[PDB]
Paper text:
Each I-CreI monomer binds its own DNA target region generating the catalytic centre at the dimer interface. This region contains two catalytic aspartic acids (D20, one per each monomer). The aspartic side chains participate in the cleavage of the DNA strands along the minor groove, resulting in the hydrolysis of specific phosphodiester bonds upon the coordination of three divalent metal ions.
To broaden our analysis, we also studied the I-CreI heterodimeric variant I-CreI_3115 (Y33G/Q38K/Q44K/R68Y/R70S/D75N/I77Y/I132V-G19S/Y33V/Q38R/S40Q/Q44D/R68A/R70S/D75K/I77R). This mutant was generated using the methodology previously described, and is able to recognize and cleave the human HBB (Haemoglobin beta subunit) gene (I-CreI_3115_target, Fig. 1c upper sequence) whose mutations cause sickle cell anaemia. To understand the molecular mechanism that inhibits cleavage when a G is at −4 position flanked by a pyrimidine at position −5, we solved the crystal structures of the cleavable and the corresponding non-cleavable variant targets in the presence of catalytic (Mg2+) and non-catalytic (Ca2+) cations. As expected from in vitro cleavage experiments, the comparison of the crystal structures of the I-CreI variants in complex with its cleavable and non-cleavable target DNAs in favourable catalytic conditions (2 mM Mg2+), showed the hydrolysed phosphodiesters in the cleavable targets while the non-cleavable targets displayed the intact phosphodiester bonds. We observed that the structures of the variants in complex with the cleavable targets showed the presence of the 3 reported catalytic ions, while the structures in complex with the non-cleavable targets indicated the presence of just 2 catalytic ions, with the central metal position occupied by a water molecule. On the other hand, when the two enzyme variants were simulated bound to the I-CreI_D75N_target and I-CreI_3115_target DNA sequences, the helical parameters of A +1 were similar to those found in the ideal B-DNA conformation, with minor fluctuations typical of atomic thermal motions.
Residue numbers in the entry:
A (entry chain A): 2 to 154
B (entry chain B): 2 to 155
The structure:
DNA sequence: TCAGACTTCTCCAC
DNA sequence: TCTGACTCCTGTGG
DNA sequence: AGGAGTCAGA
DNA sequence: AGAAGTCTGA
């Protein structure tokens, strides 16, 4: 539980509300109990020419990783435990994606209890929809109603 | 001069480094002293769906205007005097765009003296090229060399 | 003349 | 099984 | 920016 | 994001 500087969070929040992205998605997984897995993500996009800025962020945050894919580099953070602790400090300074942050945190806290009953799993899948709704959902496929069709078995 | 909150300057600097922009232009102006007008500009582009965010900027900064462009809205600030005061306070928090900001402030200070001899005017025009080079210039047309050709003709 | 108010354009960086 | 590191793709919003 | 995938070690 | 412009009034 590394604590982050307030002035660091303020700048970062402004950068996140601009080029950052708080994603929460459902992926097919035939090896899990409900044939679907959850994926919470903290993304910060920037062009590869300025990938160094993303590298500096891996150190300041501590955990996380930067990937390249063409003329664009991406800082990711999918690891649950540090993600919850990170957003919990970042959230009060967001002005655009603040709603997405509180939703992701709520999912993370209700993550173990959502592996027991299918209805509790569907409820979380609903919370996932409430995040893509706020975002610019363009290429989203697997939703909560997708699970419902498969869950009926 | 207006003083801004550090908390506001910290958040905004990140947003400026993210989706904001810092421009320096040399516009053709036949009714000008040297057939050209200098227009320094600080802008924050954002989706019109989130225009309210740009509307708050006008109140928080105290100046500037917000216009549309289809699905794109822009908060511009070209008024030289409050611009100089704003970028002076925003610069220490800029990371990706601190170099451009200090160059704008550098131009503004030497602006009335630039209207003297063309050689002093052209030096400032070269300082505009520096700002453009730092930015991801794609559709730039008028540079200092455009001015040089015109003034060497008269 | 001039300087601020308003719009149009276009690609790549998200 | 279940998590995280890793790549790839699309379409506007800068 | 917002997703869609894949794959291996644990 | 980063330019290209027009148009008023003082
Ligand atoms: Mg943005
Ligand atoms: Mg940017
Ligand atoms: Mg952007």
């Amino acid at each position: 539980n590394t604590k982050y500087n307030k002035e660091f969070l303020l700048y970062l929040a402004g950068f996140v509300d601009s080029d950052g992205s708080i994603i929460a998605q459902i992926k097919p997984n035939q090896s899990v109990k409900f044939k679907h897995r959850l994926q919470l993500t903290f993304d910060v996009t920037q062009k590869t020419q300025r990938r160094w800025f993303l590298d500096k962020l891996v150190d300041e945050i501590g955990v996380g990783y930067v990937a390249d894919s063409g003329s664009v580099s991406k800082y990711r953070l999918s690891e649950i435990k540090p993600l919850h602790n990170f957003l919990t400090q970042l959230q009060p300074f967001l002005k655009l994606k603040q709603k997405q942050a509180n939703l992701v945190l709520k999912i993370i806290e209700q993550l173990p209890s959502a592996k027991e009953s299918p209805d509790k799993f569907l409820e979380v899948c609903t919370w996932v929809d409430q995040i893509a709704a706020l975002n610019d959902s363009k290429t989203r496929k697997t939703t909560s109603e997708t699970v419902r069709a498969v869950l009926d078995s």
